Design a protein around this ligand. Structure first.
Ligand SMILES: *Cc1cc2c(cc1C)nc1c(=O)[nH]c(=O)nc-1n2C[C@H](O)[C@H](O)[C@H](O)COP(=O)(O)OP(=O)(O)OC[C@H]1O[C@@H](n2cnc3c(N)ncnc32)[C@H](O)[C@@H]1O
Ligand code: F3S
Lengths: 530, 114
């Protein structure tokens, strides 16, 4: 009936919707089923608790990127590393996310028209709103009410209100908004429970959201996998897909997948949804070149794997003069959103900026022992407490504009343990981002000044942020674009792509709520095809 | 007086904490032995120099290494323990150990009391 490929959120929502409307479903997950208690124990037993991939092993047959230390799965060329993370396992990469759950703002959808750069969406905010709201309700998202304007106009209030801000984050909101109300520091919307919700407990302040909440007080992809399964979808773990076959009638006829042995298998149904992620999905597509489609399925555009995007990151850290004590409650409760929009967006990149509320005991204890100076236990404790108390760090997402030379292709040369080719990402970061970043570095310096900042360190190397978007871009017309404004493939009237791959613009904020929205949209549209 | 005995009394002096666990102490010892404490004279010599007089940079640096292990709970990028790592007890009044709830919940709006 429907084969869905990818058991993350993008694809589990879809699977759950349809198997609810009775129409029988098959969900293929490359990775294995690993339960929460195991991820947790793996975390407790990892030596660098700042490595958010570390408690998620790459299966030989369905590997994913690692960097503590490198496993080399991705082939990175170009001028910059696309060292984003993701997880291959039942439930997908939102095992390990922060559950930041934003909406894009209206102008984000009309970037060339309005700002004369990048590239419009076909649909616009209006069209997405009611799906945002449904996504918020399905994920369980809390957020502020009318006392704070998040610049994406709402029909309903948030399903939940925030838990109170930590001292750290409220004090800094108050101080920063008092220096410059332009900054508009606000409480951040997040897929996390301020009360018992859809059967999940309220948030307790494990301060471990990356890389696992132990109790599921925040949303994880697994929630809708389990939903889909009770609603009668068939989960097949360790089924890693490497080809879709195109049938005579131009549609999609089957998906081919290797198990953990390298042995090959074949799955048929009526409709096909790729919700692999923004890398593995292009990869499957081009692995699938064949007689009638010499350029790889859905790629009459030449745009598949292309347009690849993520939020080039940039940071500051210092010791504040006031005590603040990061590490209490969630790792992020707040954001500084006053530069998501502006005329400047024609010249240079917009950002969201966010203060970290991560515990820094380890970090700052480690630091002190590096100074190579024996202390009386009392000095040592005094200092651990003080340093851990006063550390502050800001990071940020910059927008990067969709660019066709930024792309992922399946390696001609390199391969994995079961004989599937490997992602080869070319990627560069141009002056649009870099001029945005120069302004950010000034906000940072000002934040430091305001907060009595000491030992200020600027982090000017662009970090990844795991927001993998572009690679099957969304279009009006089917040749500079892969999917219509419904995430139907232009080339295959029975293939949809549920992923941030589809998003032509990456905007200023975490992309996953938008995905959840598109997923529900798609699932409506598909519910109509008997 | 075996190596453990000396280790344990050493660590007490260095950490200032009474009632350090010998079960964990054993494990830290054995991991530290992989590639520290060249001799068998090191531990005793460290105790005497510490207890009374004063330390070579090298001796200082051994003491640090011992301290490092108790406070971080890790030795050569292996976790010996997580809960009982001492840095957490130094801030247990205010900060949680990541992945462990406070026994009563949403506490964190307060400014901590010094
Ligand atoms: C790493 C990370 C990511 C992250 C984050 C923090 C961290 C540390 N914080 C986020 C946040 O605050 N807000 C947000 O919106 N996103 C955040 N992210 C990224 C987020 O996890 C992703 O955007 C999200 O997971 C995307 O959802 P999607 O379902 O599209 O992708 P996925 O969760 O990676 O799931 C993909 C599944 O498909 C399977 N797969 C892949 N290839 C294949 C093949 N060939 N065959 C079969 N299955 C396949 C994967 O196994 C995976 O389960
Ligand atoms: S990991 Fe879990 S309970 Fe609260 S702050 Fe983070 S969600």
């Amino acid at each position: 009936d429907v084969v869905v490929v990818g058991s993350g959120v993008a694809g589990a929502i879809v699977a759950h919707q349809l198997a609810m409307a009775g129409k029988a479903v098959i969900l293929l997950e490359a990775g294995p089923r690993m339960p929460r208690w195991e991820i947790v124990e793996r975390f407790r037993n990892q030596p660098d608790k700042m490595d958010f991939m570390a408690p998620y092993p790459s299966s030989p047959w369905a590997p994913h990127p690692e960097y503590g230390p490198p496993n080399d799965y991705l082939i990175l060329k170009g001028e910059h590393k696309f060292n984003s993370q993701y997880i291959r396992a039942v439930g997908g990469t939102t095992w390990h996310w922060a559950a930041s759950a934003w909406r894009f703002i209206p102008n984000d959808f009309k970037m060339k028209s309005v700002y004369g750069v990048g590239r419009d969406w076909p649909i616009q905010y209006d069209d997405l709103e009611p799906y945002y709201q449904r996504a918020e309700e399905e994920l369980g998202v809390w957020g502020p009410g009318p006392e704070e304007d998040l610049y994406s106009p709402r029909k309903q209030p948030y399903p939940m209100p925030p838990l109170p801000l930590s001292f750290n984050e409220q004090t800094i909101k108050t101080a920063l908004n008092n220096y410059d109300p332009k900054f508009h520091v606000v409480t951040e919307p997040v897929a996390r429970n301020s009360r018992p919700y859809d059967g999940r407990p309220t948030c307790c302040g494990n301060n471990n959201c990356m890389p696992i909440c132990p109790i599921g007080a925040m949303y994880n992809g697994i929630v809708h996998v389990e939903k889909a399964e009770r609603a009668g979808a068939k989960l097949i773990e360790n089924a890693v897909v490497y080809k879709l076959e195109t049938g005579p009638d131009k549609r999609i006829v089957a998906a081919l997948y290797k198990d953990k042995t390298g042995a090959e298998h074949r799955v048929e149904g009526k409709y096909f949804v790729l919700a692999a992620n923004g890398i593995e999905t292009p990869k499957i597509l081009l692995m699938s070149a064949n007689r009638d489609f010499p350029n790889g399925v859905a790629n009459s555009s030449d745009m598949v794997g292309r347009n690849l995007m993520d939020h080039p990151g940039t940071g500051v850290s210092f010791y504040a003069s006031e005590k603040l004590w990061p590490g209490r409650g969630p790792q992020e409760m707040t954001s500084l959103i006053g530069f998501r929009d502006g005329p400047f967006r024609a010249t240079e990149a917009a950002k969201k900026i966010h203060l970290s509320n991560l515990s820094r005991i380890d970090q700052e204890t480690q630091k002190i022992f590096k100074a190579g100076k024996l202390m009386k236990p009392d000095e040592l404790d005094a200092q651990i407490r003080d340093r851990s108390a006063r550390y502050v760090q800001f990071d940020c997402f910059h927008e990067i504009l969709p660019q066709p030379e930024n792309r992922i292709v399946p390696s001609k040369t390199a391969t994995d343990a079961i004989g599937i080719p490997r992602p080869e990402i070319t990627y560069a970061i141009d002056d649009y981002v870099k001029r945005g970043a120069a302004h950010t570095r000034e906000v940072y310096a000002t934040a430091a000044k305001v907060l009595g900042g000491t030992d200020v360190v600027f982090n000017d190397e662009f970090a990844p942020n795991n927001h993998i978007t572009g690679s099957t871009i969304m279009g009006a017309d089917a040749r500079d674009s892969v999917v219509d404004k419904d995430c139907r493939t232009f080339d295959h009237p029975n293939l949809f792509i549920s992923s941030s791959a589809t998003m032509p613009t990456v905007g200023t904020v975490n992309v996953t709520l938008t995905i959840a929205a598109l997923a529900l949209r798609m699932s409506d549209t598909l519910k109509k095809e008997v | 007086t075996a190596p453990l005995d000396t280790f344990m009394t050493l660590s007490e002096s260095l950490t200032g904490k009474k009632g350090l666990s010998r079960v964990i102490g054993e494990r830290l010892l054995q991991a530290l032995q992989k590639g520290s404490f060249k001799t068998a004279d090191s531990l005793p010599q460290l105790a005497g120099a510490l207890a009374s007089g004063s330390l070579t940079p090298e001796q200082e640096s051994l003491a640090l290494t011992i301290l490092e292990a108790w406070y971080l709970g890790i030795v050569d990028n292996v976790v010996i323990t997580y809960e009982e790592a001492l840095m957490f007890g130094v801030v247990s009044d205010t900060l949680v150990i990541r992945s462990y709830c406070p026994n009563k919940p949403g506490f964190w709006a307060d400014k901590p009391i010094e």
